[PDB]
Design a binder for this molecule. Structure first.
Ligand SMILES: Nc1ncnc2c1ncn2[C@@H]1O[C@H](COP(=O)(O)OP(=O)(O)OP(O)(O)=S)[C@@H](O)[C@H]1O
Ligand SMILES: Nc1ncnc2c1ncn2[C@@H]1O[C@H](COP(=O)(O)OP(=O)(O)OP(O)(O)=S)[C@@H](O)[C@H]1O
Ligand SMILES: Nc1ncnc2c1ncn2[C@@H]1O[C@H](COP(=O)(O)OP(=O)(O)O)[C@@H](O)[C@H]1O
Ligand SMILES: Nc1ncnc2c1ncn2[C@@H]1O[C@H](COP(=O)(O)OP(=O)(O)O)[C@@H](O)[C@H]1O
Ligand SMILES: [Mg+2]
Ligand SMILES: [Mg+2]
Ligand SMILES: [Mg+2]
Ligand SMILES: [Mg+2]
Lengths: 97, 22, 426, 426, 443, 434, 69
């Protein structure tokens, strides 16, 4: 049953290559202060200081399997194949080497 | 708003002293 | 090599400098008056002066309304935002129809902005926490070294990227994004077998600064100011997995976003590019959508919405006794300028079939093309257009390139029209 | 507030004199003498603030100036006073009950002004000296136009300045109570006097804003996201009793405003039943309702009504009726519109536009101005002449001509029964 | 994982090299015009150039329209997407009708990205991992051999951790992916030195691999366009690929994905393989769905849509007027209609014989003739269902063949629509009528 | 001790290579329907077909639900039977199609048979044997680790491989502990201390378990039963733990979701792999949808599509209607409530009304089930009412008659009690008159 | 923590502290508090309690207060 049943976490971990290949898009506009303002974790929020620090520390220590998706959808890097595509000399040098 | 990346020199930077002048 | 669609042959309105339209240019045949009217509308959009202007492309089926809309989009260019839509797309289940209409309104208004990007990249030479604490990182490159102090969010990003000494990273200062691009080349031969993918040491100085111009829409700014949208921190993950569904954005957020955009334009860092919202099959809209569209057009920041319908004297959806010229209630009709689209005679049908065949890389004999044109006149123009691909397939199966009359007859006997199928049903 | 040109941009006021008698043409409004007089009476009632829960119905034929009248009332009422304008189709939401949406709209139009007296020091920083524990010893110097003194910091002020990382030579603002620091550029600007000043800041909020702020832990985000939800009634009662207590104490004042529902003929019987009682209670704003239909069936009911509204609500309202314009008023309205759109029409062109508007519709002639301007620009002409307007008339159709064309060719359009003759032959 | 289903007996359209339908091939019988049209549509799909065509399959019930669709799907084979949906599936509670139709349309377009990967394969000789107790430093080397070469690799930390997790031993033949880093245990080379536990669980030996130790292989990643849209819609969209709850993906995501995929095609990175979308009983769709289908077929990234209908003239859902096929004229104008006809006695007989072959039921000649007469009289599907019950009745009799008497018993026990209607009309008082009245007592 | 409405239906009561007995298994009459249900049960046991539909057509009080329950009892509890009412499909969290598919895949079942070899017993010896180092280096090497386990009427010493040291350290076992070590995996697991050392300390938090019986080496065959729905839900659900996804799952209540076809196909693929490996067997099962008249036309169309699925159960439908309009349609009058498209795909079995003798026999057998005694005259009167008003009316009236007889200190039901109950409790007809 | 005493108001010329006066009356004051609360208030308090300082508790606090049966 550990093989017939696979939770979402192990599916996220096992499909690393697909996530790397097909996660391309990034947000058009972002605002960094909204990330903490939504949770009430800003420095001047109505939540008490001790609770804010405890929540922040717990968030620091917790483990998330969606980290790769976050980093792929946050910044986009051109694929390495683009270097070959932009220079026929490199294209033929590849087969020569 | 806030600069998340700051440049510091190892010899100069220290938290015990903060200073700025004209 | 290339694929073909309904409007792949439509490259533009084909209007000259004076505004008169040639009989056959830009893939269009006939429809001269509608092309001239759409050229006037394109000039109005390019003026970037008025807001909320609306026009209606009124005509029968298979007459060239969606083609005219796509031609307007082509003439305006990829710089401007042109949002295609269908009347059936506004009946959402997460948010009300009014919110969807407003979001599409603000998606058709374009903004072009200039932003300076501060970028750091190099081989890590030190990872010392200051003690949730700041991290002191030392980046080395081929031209120099640099030591930086990073906020705790960047520290969490680095921690979850498994960055150690000798790794090469890429910190974007504006957004706080950290990407581990690989391991330095100097350590390639340390081990004969490890999963690490090595990269060369970055060239240039560690601190790089570039100015990029990026195109955004007002809807993008609204979404950015409404909900958290990115990040590699667990805080952002929880913020965005909380309240995931769409929300009914208030007028206050839109007003504040408008003030921000006005400040950006006044400083000269941004320019505005009003665009077009195209709503095809407008008769599917309910009376409430039309009623709100009446108010939304009066907004001082609105696109040039173009509407298309193929119905006449039809009752309006939602109402039970309102007979309207095109399914559009008279209140909205008074806000619109109607561009009438006219049917096609036999010669223009023949030319359209010829050009469609030329686009799909097919060869049609003159007699077979005449038969196809006369059967399109008899039954339907689109029916004649869709018969081309089966005819080409049949011709290829007989080891023959050009389409002949026999292949057309076989295709007709295989695939039927609406009238013939209904007659068979009778 | 940068924005494009709308259809109501020219209306900058209601155009009344001291005796509330409207001038023939002032503040962008033309004609509608009795309607503007009554609107001025309503405006005086709003400004007085001693009358609550009054409903005024702005009824009349279409294209007569109901929305223009409301816009003039809003502009003459000015800022610093709430004015909520919602279409009747905005009530129907999938997250808020119609009664809850109407309640939120009602509360949005009652403003509360709260004065906060803050002690803030403003000046140009010169030197900052911070030392390690000997918890922390710190001195800052602030220069202004006539003083230059040092300040002995404490622990929390030192922590705040380190967090902000204030440099030297830059204008800074520090609040004594809150501790917030607002940065400003180097002294275009310069400090203007004493180091520590006593200036009060006034905050304008609505009852709905207070309700949403107290609704959750961080409810003030919902004022932008729109996920307020149906607020508990006990919370609203608390807000009401605290506003009464604050007004008694004199630490906050109430500014009653105007709620405008543009298309009341779309609200159902439940909404009207709610409005009837919501008007009676205190803190009820003045509700302006615009309708055009003479006698129609109220939504949710199977019977006709004198305006599409139930008789109970009409008993509670005073009706302002607008009358159709004549040729001279059409001419001057079109002149105002042309001046707003930066179009120089000729005398004969204006006369042709006026006759077209009288024959067909005022909105149709108003929309033709920009199209005529674009047509003239294609001819490299500045002033819009008669022939440009004639070409605009030929290219763009109005409601009556479009209906005539549809009626004369009813076969080629899709009818209510779903029949069409796409085939040009037979 | 499959069982003997209704259309399990057809493996394709059964056509010659010139698209001429064979009299009986690949499971299909008759329907020569329909099969030729289906083959033309098959060639159109395989060409990959024509986009957004709509094709309708009309005809009486039990004329083989769904069989025709299954034949087209089987001729397409794998690697060409085929999305079979019903008209009832669109009406959801978490998504709009237009959104569900958009997702169904995008499910039929496949994107293939091919990658070349280096793979190490061989039989382990010696593995040695040295780790300090209460210390983080680990050092290890392994000797992986092939029939023609042997070498030693000194390992980094992550490879050591992976091999320790995989429980690699000496008698193991394993594969190492230098990019991904996964270790796959292909099999064993010999026994484990006769320890007590796990005595003889490694008897299934595998041959030692042959050739270059480090060889390059190509890997193809096939993903539909809808999956890419769901991945890029939000950060949690990857979970939405399995859970559902994708939401209504914003139009900007779809436009950007379209542009990126077009760039990929122009760059040769990705290969686009358009497929077929098949809607069962399209007459259940609303008029809004038909309008959206009308517009969405004009997109360049659209598949080829095929629909099945048997209603004749009927009221379109969402409107109060009858339409020629249960569909509005706007959708009929842009669709090519292929028709199906009723079956002869001989075609019914051979379909019954094919089904009996698929169900592994041996029918006698007289039994087959009786079944054919029954099917002509009552229904093709009725006799098809009767075949298996007759087989079970024969088994109850302890006979390996179905005779006429077994079919007679099955006919007596199980009824057709006409007989049930007759029995209802004769005994109407024993059933609840539309007015909600029934007699329960017998006296 | 409880008595529902179908406690006496133990089965169809057929005989091998024969027909339905007149009275057997709690059934009286309905010979043809019982024989048809028997051949359907044989078809289900064959486990070689998918998407087979039978419709139980007849009037009220004709035995349809009894026939479905008899099919369930005849197939046994191992075959997954999924009773359902057509009204249940109309959920609020998901669409009707999703609920129908979930029921379909709940009807299919999987049986996993795994044999495992394990050594269990109290740990008595723990000694590693030193051996010569192949690499030298003057280090201390171990070639085996010796574990001695003692059991009830059994004890053995094992020369395990050196790898066991990691599992021993991880499970912090000790002398006196009883452990569980898999023969082929190499893992260990301690279930507690031996009861013999419960006296060594007056207080101890750990649980002392009895010493396991039998020989130390035990081979056990574990059989587990799962359904495709269970696998799909388990794969669509987070594992549950300290990770952030599980935290937001705790925050947001888990609603039903449209499980995508990709997940279902993955489940099918893994199931097929393990079936081919020989560890799993597939059981089709039965999906019984009572009151099929309540289903809408959309659900019927989706049934039309889903019956053609290559993996689908046997669907049994029951309807007490004649010519009635199909729900969701305005002018589709079809036999029973099922639209003609679905009727063409199913087989109909009739359920006949009963005679006086059948009603009397049913009443007396039900009275026997309810542990009641009735006089012959009372039974005749009860059957007369059953033929006069309804069978279920008399069957329900049995219990109040018993209560009245018990209140009168009598151990038997008499005509007086029957008439007293008749006056106290009215039927539908007499109440309609009133 | 009510705040800082007015006694130490002028200890530093620039400091962010909410200076508050010394409390009146005795240090140890016993007061009888009377409140009027509806039964629905108790029902709401039990249904959606505000206690807890866990991450889950705070995340639930941020969520909208939808009415429940
Ligand atoms: N004047 C024209 N010249 C060239 N191609 C045309 C012309 N008019 C139509 N077409 C093409 O013929 C087809 C007709 O489709 P449309 O232009 O969308 O007609 P339509 O008015 O949109 O009909 P509806 O309202 O969508 S049903 C498309 O493939 C067009 O590209
Ligand atoms: N042949 C039979 N032999 C014995 N008891 C029977 C027989 N047929 C029905 N019953 C019993 O009669 C009662 C009612 O019959 P059911 O089968 O449960 O109802 P039904 O005939 O399916 O009618 P509906 O559709 O539920 S209203 C139950 O207690 C059954 O156990
Ligand atoms: N009294 C007026 N003075 C100036 N402009 C007017 C007046 N009445 C109407 N208009 C113009 O006519 C246009 C349409 O009027 P509108 O507000 O739509 O009236 P209604 O809502 O009754 O149709 C507006 O753009 C407005 O500028
Ligand atoms: N031309 C054919 N060749 C082989 N089998 C057929 C043919 N037509 C129908 N069948 C069989 O008869 C049954 C008809 O099913 P289906 O195609 O769903 O009918 P419909 O066309 O009404 O949808 C199927 O099980 C199919 O196997
Ligand atoms: Mg169109
Ligand atoms: Mg108006
Ligand atoms: Mg079918
Ligand atoms: Mg029942």
């Amino acid at each position: 049953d550990n093989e017939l049943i696979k939770p979402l976490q192990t599916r996220v971990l096992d499909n690393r290559k697909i996530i790397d290949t097909f996660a391309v898009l990034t947000p058009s506009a972002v605002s960094l202060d909204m990330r903490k303002l939504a949770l009430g974790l800003n420095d001047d929020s109505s939540v008490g200081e001790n609770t804010r620090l405890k929540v922040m520390q717990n968030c620091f220590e917790v483990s998330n399997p969606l980290h790769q998706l976050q980093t792929k959808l946050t910044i986009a890097f051109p694929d390495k194949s683009l270097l070959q595509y932009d220079c026929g000399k490199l294209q033929k040098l590849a087969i020569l080497l | 708003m806030k600069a998340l990346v700051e440049e510091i020199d190892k010899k100069t930077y220290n938290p015990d002293i903060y200073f700025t002048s004209l | 090599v290339t694929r073909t669609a309904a409007h792949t042959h439509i490259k533009g309105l084909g209007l000259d400098e004076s505004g008169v339209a040639k009989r056959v240019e830009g893939g269009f045949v006939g429809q001269i008056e509608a092309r001239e009217a759409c050229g006037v509308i394109v000039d109005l959009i390019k003026a970037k002066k008025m807001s909320g202007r609306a026009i209606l492309l009124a005509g029968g089926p298979s007459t060239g309304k969606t083609a005219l809309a796509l031609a307007i989009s082509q003439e305006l260019g990829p710089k401007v935002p042109f949002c295609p839509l269908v009347g059936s797309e506004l009946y959402s289940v997460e948010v009300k129809k009014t919110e969807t209409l407003m979001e599409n309104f603000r998606r058709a208004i374009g903004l072009r902005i200039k932003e300076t990007k501060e970028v750091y990249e190099g081989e890590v030479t030190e990872l010392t926490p200051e003690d949730i604490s700041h991290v002191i990182v030392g980046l080395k490159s081929a031209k120099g070294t640099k030591t930086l102090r990073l906020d705790p969010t960047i520290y969490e990003s680095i921690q979850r990227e498994k960055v150690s000494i000798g790794d090469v990273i890429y910190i974007e200062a504006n957004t706080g994004a950290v990407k581990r691009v690989g391991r330095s080349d100097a350590y390639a031969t340390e081990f004969d077998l490890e999963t690490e993918e090595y990269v060369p040491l970055p060239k240039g100085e560690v601190h790089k600064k570039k100015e990029i111009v990026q195109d955004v829409t007002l809807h993008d700014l609204d979404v950015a100011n409404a909900r958290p949208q990115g990040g590699q921190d667990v805080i952002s993950m929880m913020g965005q997995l909380l309240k995931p569904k769409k929300t009914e954005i208030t007028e206050k957020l839109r007003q504040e976003v408008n003030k921000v955009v006005a400040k950006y334009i006044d400083q000269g860092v941004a320019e505005l590019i009003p665009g077009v919202l195209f709503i095809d099959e407008v008769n599917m809209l309910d009376i409430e959508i039309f009623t709100y569209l009446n108010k939304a057009l009066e907004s001082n920041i609105a696109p040039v919405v173009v509407l298309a319908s193929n119905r006449g004297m039809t009752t309006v959806r939602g109402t039970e006794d309102v007979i309207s010229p095109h399914g559009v209630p008279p209140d909205l009709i008074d806000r619109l300028l109607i561009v009438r689209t006219l049917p096609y005679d036999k010669d223009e049908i023949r030319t359209i079939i010829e050009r469609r065949a030329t686009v799909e890389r097919l060869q049609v004999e003159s007699s077979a093309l005449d038969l196809l044109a006369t059967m399109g006149t008899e039954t339907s123009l689109r029916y004649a257009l869709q018969l081309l691909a089966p005819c080409g397939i049949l011709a290829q199966t007989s080891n023959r390139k050009e389409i002949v009359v026999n292949d057309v007859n076989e295709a007709k006997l295989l695939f039927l029209d609406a009238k013939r199928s209904t007659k068979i049903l009778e | 507030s940068l924005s494009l040109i709308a259809a109501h941009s020219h209306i900058t006021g209601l155009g009344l004199d001291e005796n509330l008698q409207p001038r023939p043409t002032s503040e962008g409004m033309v004609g509608q003498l009795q309607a503007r007089r009554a609107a001025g009476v309503i405006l005086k009632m709003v400004q007085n603030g001693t009358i609550a829960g009054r409903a005024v119905l702005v009824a009349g034929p279409p294209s007569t100036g109901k929305t223009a009248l409301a816009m003039g009332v809003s502009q003459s009422l000015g800022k610093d006073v709430p004015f909520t304008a919602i279409a009747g189709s905005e009530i129907f939401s999938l997250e808020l009950s119609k009664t809850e949406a109407l309640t939120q709209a009602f509360r949005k139009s009652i403003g509360i002004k709260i004065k906060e007296e803050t002690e803030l020091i403003e000046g140009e920083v010169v030197e900052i000296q911070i030392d390690r524990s000997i918890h922390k010893q710190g001195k800052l110097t602030i220069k202004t136009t006539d003083m230059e003194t040092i300040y002995e910091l404490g622990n929390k002020m030192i922590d705040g300045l380190t967090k902000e990382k204030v440099l030297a030579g830059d204008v800074i603002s520090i609040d004594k109570a809150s501790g917030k620091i607002t940065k400003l550029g180097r002294s275009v600007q310069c400090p203007e006097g004493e180091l520590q000043k006593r200036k009060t800041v006034v905050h304008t909020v609505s009852l709905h804003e207070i309700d949403v702020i107290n609704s959750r832990t961080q409810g003030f985000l919902a004022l932008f996201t729109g996920d307020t939800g149906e607020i508990r009634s006990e919370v609203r009662d608390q807000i009401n009793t605290k506003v009464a207590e604050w007004k008694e104490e004199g630490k906050a004042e109430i500014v009653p405003g105007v709620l405008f529902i543009d298309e009341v003929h779309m609200l159902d019987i439940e909404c009207f039943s709610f409005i009837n009682r919501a008007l009676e209670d205190e803190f009820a704003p003045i509700v302006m309702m615009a309708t055009n239909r003479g006698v129609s069936k109220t939504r949710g009911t199977n019977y006709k009504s004198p305006h599409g509204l139930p008789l109970d609500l009409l008993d509670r309202s005073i009706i302002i009726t607008t009358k159709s314009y004549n040729e001279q008023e059409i001419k001057t309205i079109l002149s105002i519109r042309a001046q707003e759109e930066e179009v120089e029409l000729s005398s004969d062109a204006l006369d042709l536009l006026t006759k077209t508007g009288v024959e067909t519709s005022l909105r149709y002639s108003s929309n033709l101005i920009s199209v005529a301007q674009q047509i003239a620009m294609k001819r490299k002409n500045n002033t819009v002449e008669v022939e440009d307007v004639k070409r605009a008339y030929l290219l763009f159709l109005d409601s009556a001509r479009s209906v005539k064309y549809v009626q004369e060719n009813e076969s080629q359009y899709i009818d209510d029964q779903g029949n069409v003759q796409i085939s040009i032959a037979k």
